[PDB]
């Protein structure tokens, strides 16, 4: 069940053959067309009108730089174009129709009055047409390249947090010294380093883009509980597993009994971990929000524990 | 070591450069080229002919629509082309060889008698043609794009599960009620959801097209021993990571002491597990079957467990 | 260390070597002697009078039956006997010399001013009589046999609970019952019998005479805390291991699932205990106070557990 | 923060639209453009001169056919090309821009003093040309294609070692023989093979071509520490997983008792392992080394034992 | 509640005060009184007849010698004695009055139609008379020494054993041998003996005299069950606890890997143990049967293992 | 199997039924008789002469004050007495003939050559004499009382100690104190008492009278091996239980992080342990030396153990 955008929410329509992106201008002369695609153009931008009544179920396709909207026909030339009225004429209404296998993020635009489908294609002209619906070519497919969208917020769900697994991991054994008896101070110090593990990933919502950088706490295991480690200030990139460094840092001290030589041995559990979240977005251009559900997943640590003894 | 087809089956041609594939037609007038993928097109499939003799470990490709054979030759125009006669010419035999890094599950149709590689490219006329096999260039590679193929089977090796992981998750500890002494009952009821997690992974024999959709059981460790869960019906996606929803549900009461307050602990084995598998296939225009050998993974739990106490 | 009596509390003189207990009366004709227990004959029941002054350290032994306290002297005839005045006379100051080995239980009655020892037999006449002190003969040597006092309450000292060991005994596994699905109920009963264990072991203060028989709640582990179990009504007898029964009694119901068989597993940890307690006694025939100090000793059970499963 | 080479180093600019890389060559006729890839032409490879003093941080683009260096300019005709002197004029140095998102492994090739953007594309001629920098579209986009380079060795770093998850694997319990009393042998056999796990993934450093072929010692957890184990000759791929089979053989005997039957259970720890390490390469055309550093990680198994009982 | 025996059984009774025991003979001229023990005097065997009727709850006294019955009287000389017809007077029926605290296992013989009570005393004349009943002295007290009894048989209750303690005891870690890699060859020996310990105490019927020797099979702990050790034969004594040894024998081989030195722990589980249990016996001049029922009580070792590893 | 002393060795001949010890002296005018014991009577002790030859296996009984040797015999008046020449005549050999039951600890002196058997009562007179052996009187039986001895030194079997139960004491939990963040130190103390126990139990070899007072180090476990404690000076007494206290003392300190509470848990392990040894004594009046072999036995705590952790 494919993502498709709200009214407010702008991108880019890239075919899956031609590899470049719909245009809509009033000038300069050929009106629409094929571009590679250039963030900044206003052009290449498009958002959907809803069908309702008897188009429920059905877009149109309105341009952001022009305000028209796409149409698709068969017998008057040309076949497809730019046109006023949001929808107007049943020649703007489009039924998205999701691929499989390798095009299973990518959809045919088929507008089914007149049995036509949309075509983006390199090879032959023009670049950007409509065919026949029945006769179904792999240049028909689309996909979404939607408007750069910031991240302005993750709130995990921390109840529904999971260890999926857990072994102990001596940190520093070693770290024990001695002088037999009385005495009075042995000190002891711990910095170890582990590397932890950071993925994002997507489960429902809006398709943020992989890559997308971005900043945040990250889950961690408290005792009884999970909690979110606000100091972790790496960049993330969105689907993507990232690496960061987990320092622990203790100082300690012991001796006063009969005749001892102390041991510290500072222990961690580490393990994959899992956490539920819900991020907020926002458009740059625009400030319309969406939400994406997914779940953080991470080799992490946790129970820092510092045991002492003693020997003769 | 690359899946070639038996003799059986059907596929495309789909070029590395072009990413469009060949055909083989009787008519219109140019009878071989590219073409954008049409499913449904017949001009695109082909099988391989297995070479004997001193054509054994070569192949002739005999188109589909036609039953003619694919020609790579020098001197003689047109280079390419198609052909009557199950390989009677040593124009019609060719050798697969797979690419490396990028091209890994690409490969070359090399024509050794007249030293000469297919080629299939968009950039310079005829896109469908040869070259002198000793320079090697990006748009003589070619992959093969199955024909549709339906999974009717999966077999799992259940003697051969594992456990990668292992930690308690604790459902429901709370569910803890009291009337100090005699009384009757307390009855109890657990209704907790796990996500869980599910992966194909192709491990031998036929190549399933990434994405793939299917249904099937998924393996489960019972307490001794792993099983089939035929209760999951999601629609996975072969290759690829799915989640679904484990609901773990329970009632039982309790009371029957001098004086005490039940509580109810419900616990489960959460972890990683693994178990071979064999699915079955085979094609929907004309019944041939392969098998596929590969590994299930996920995320999964096991041994439900509810514990009863005593407190005053 | 041996505990004296303080001056409100009555005893017997048990010679180790007579076997026999010294008497005071005004008549019959023969005052003071030796003579069988008899628990209600006033003439064997002696207090003590603490020396004081020069005589502090030192014991005046005062006749219940006469109010008379006892002599020994050696020029003047008899040796040995009664009179007036509450130790007038430094003949009726003692020291208390406790025994050794098989004699630690007992002690001399020597009158240092006189050098003269008190002396209990059945070989020689006078059998209650003296000697020299500086020759230590075994029929010099006595014991306190207490009159009979009430044990009135048990105080244990609960915090200073210990466990000693603990193993898990599984009291009823079977309890395992099916009809595979649907249904509804499978109702379950334990009931299992543990022989546990009780002694009341002296640690310090007044001493008991072994054997006596009281009753009293008896320690239990809860499940972080030690507790008394008031159920428990069998006759103990002090310083001596006793045993008694613990019934554990349970009912509890299941089955609401897809398709399992129920299994029901009943245990308990069980070990040895022990928990110090001061023990509140006072005399039956007076009401004089007095307390004894003691560690308690038992194996037993604690944390009742039942844990419930499923099978296909 | 991508990987730009040092300046021993040779490569290919292969452009994100063209899907083609750039040619320099003295003849034939055009002497700069766009081609298919082929490893062995050397009109294909290029190093970096490394600007300095004003030119810091940039870069020229050295052709290694012909010697001479790329420059982008906007007045002159032709915009692009080829030109003696290692620099010597403005128009030579170049800001590499990384993209983001889909384009993060590719960047822009921008020449600061004209404003100027490199441009590669199959759409629109000349293929290989320019454009005003301020204008970003997607064809100004390029790759590192590095050239092939052998991987000498991996260094494992070994103290650093990690067991990410532990859970115990049966491999045979069954192998429970029996002939009562005296006799004197019973021997065992243990041959029990386990599906590993391997994958070599990229930490920093040069980038090695997803895919790459090679060999190498995989480490395995002892019982105290990792170590590397040699015997495993599998070919492995760089950054993606392979299997391999790891199979434990033993033989042990036992009987000699009283009247028992002897059980042998063979175990082992299996779960997910990971192992920082450094790898050292060279240039097969030159010898030039450059390392990369990894972490790798898979499920494996440890600490074989064997366990001996006795039944009546 | 004491032990009193059935009709057919024979015993002494010893006097506290006395230690002394009661004879009744034909001839010589004193016909009863009180002798030092000598077992092979019939002169000094009694057996009781329960009284019935109104003499329900009584009993009289017959003597095994003369097969006459005591009698104990006030007005006529003499007070006690010996005559025919089995309890035809009713100066022939005997009330036993348990004692307390020291004399809990001693006990009146009070005949109450004469308010009379049996003396047996070694200071005044008559030794073996009678007293008035409401005046209580300690030389009025018996105790039963009864006939000399052989254990035929001790038949323990498994099914109610119970582990009161467990910790793992390692009986030879060391036993680690090696020569690096092929060979064939490794043998292991075990020899390691514990000190075990055996102690059969009373619980309740009849009351085997305190360090009776015996010999029987004493309990051990399989693995799920307990069972009788029918090799352990020590002379064992009644209520006592008695030591004695268990070696643990064993011998196993190894060696068939790539290159490892083996190394076997061979370990045990102790603790204490303990058992219900039944004796049974007979009387050795006659046959007559009684029982015992008893708890024994053991530190035990149980569960032998032997552990196989590697190294390099 | 009773303990005989060797030839320097004195001690006492106690009389069961007598309960009284044979004396012999030169003056005054009776000989030989019976007296309670005085320790300082050298009357009163005697060592044996070991038959050899035909008196191999018996024993004649030496007077310490008199030099001369015990006789028993039938015919000729007196029937017992002293007599010069050690062992001259066939009169002064015994052969010593242990009890059973509560004689077990007792024996008999048999003259075998003529028939008889020592004779001490105090029912009787002669007090001291002899019995035709053949009919076997409680007033035959004597036991060894020797003399007073010394406990010179405890040497345990260290290597031969085990642990019978084992079960972690939680000292002190609470010890938990914060102020969140920075700051730098927090302290901890730790003083928890625990009531140790000790028993030093025969085995085998000389018969320490029970109770005889001593000091000594006590056995330890330390963590992988037994050792003495040689700080606690408490007196002892053979053979019987007694209590110690262990106090244990730790002063440690902690804070260094980013914002953490400090938690202390201090622990240790509690049960029963058991160790071998021998004891050394010598005469006080001779410095005449034996051993005695034992099992120590008590409850103990070892593995102190603090545990830091952190919350917020
Ligand atoms: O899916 C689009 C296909 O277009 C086909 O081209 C058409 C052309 O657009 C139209 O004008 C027509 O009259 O002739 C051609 C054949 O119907 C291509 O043949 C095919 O490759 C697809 O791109
Ligand atoms: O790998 C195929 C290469 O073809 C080359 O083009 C050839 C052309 O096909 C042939 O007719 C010849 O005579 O001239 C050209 C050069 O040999 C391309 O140059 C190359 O890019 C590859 O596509
Ligand atoms: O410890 C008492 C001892 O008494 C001794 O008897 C005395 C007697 O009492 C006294 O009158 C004296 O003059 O003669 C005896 C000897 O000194 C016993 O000899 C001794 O057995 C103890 O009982
Ligand atoms: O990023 C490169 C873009 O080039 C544009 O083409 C230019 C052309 O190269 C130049 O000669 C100019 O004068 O006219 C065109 C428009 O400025 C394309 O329009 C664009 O698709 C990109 O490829
Ligand atoms: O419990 C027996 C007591 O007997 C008492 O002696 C009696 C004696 O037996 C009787 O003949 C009587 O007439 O005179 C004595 C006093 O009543 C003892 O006095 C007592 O010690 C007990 O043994
Ligand atoms: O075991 C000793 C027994 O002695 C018996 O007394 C003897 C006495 O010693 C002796 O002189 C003899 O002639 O007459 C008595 C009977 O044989 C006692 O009868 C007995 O009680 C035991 O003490």
Do not use: C
Not at 80 to 89: E, F, K, L, P, T
Not at 185 to 211: C, H, K, P, R
Not at 234 to 249: A, V
């Amino acid at each position: 069940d494919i993502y498709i955008p709200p009214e407010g929410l702008y991108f880019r329509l890239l075919g899956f053959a031609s590899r470049q992106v719909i245009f809509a201008r009033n000038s300069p002369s050929p009106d629409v067309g094929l571009s590679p695609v250039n963030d900044q153009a206003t052009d290449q931008y498009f958002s959907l009108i809803y069908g309702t009544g008897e188009h429920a179920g059905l877009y149109a396709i309105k341009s952001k730089a022009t305000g028209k909207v796409l149409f698709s026909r068969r017998p008057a030339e040309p076949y497809v174009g730019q046109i006023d009225g949001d929808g107007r004429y049943p020649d703007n209404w489009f039924k998205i129709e999701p691929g499989k296998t390798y095009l299973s993020k990518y959809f045919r635009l088929v507008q089914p009055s007149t049995g036509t489908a949309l075509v983006s294609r390199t090879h032959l002209q023009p670049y950007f047409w409509n065919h026949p619906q029945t006769e179904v070519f792999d240049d028909q497919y689309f996909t979404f390249l939607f408007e750069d969208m910031s991240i302005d917020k993750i709130e995990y769900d921390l109840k529904d947090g999971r260890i999926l697994s857990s072994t102990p991991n001596v940190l520093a054994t070693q770290t024990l010294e001695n002088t037999s008896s009385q005495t009075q101070e042995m000190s002891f110090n711990l910095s170890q380093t582990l590397t932890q593990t950071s993925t994002f990933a997507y489960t429902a919502g809006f398709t943020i883009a992989v890559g997308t950088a971005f900043k945040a706490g990250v889950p961690i295991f408290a005792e009884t509980e999970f909690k979110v480690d606000i100091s972790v200030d790496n960049q993330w990139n969105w689907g993507e597993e990232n690496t960061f460094s987990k320092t622990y840092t203790a100082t300690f001290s012991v001796r006063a009994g009969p005749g001892e030589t102390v041991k510290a041995v500072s222990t961690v559990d580490s393990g994959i971990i899992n956490v539920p979240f819900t991020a907020y977005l926002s458009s740059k251009s625009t400030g319309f929000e969406v939400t994406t559900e997914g779940i953080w997943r991470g080799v992490s640590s946790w129970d820092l524990r510092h045991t002492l003894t003693s020997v003769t």
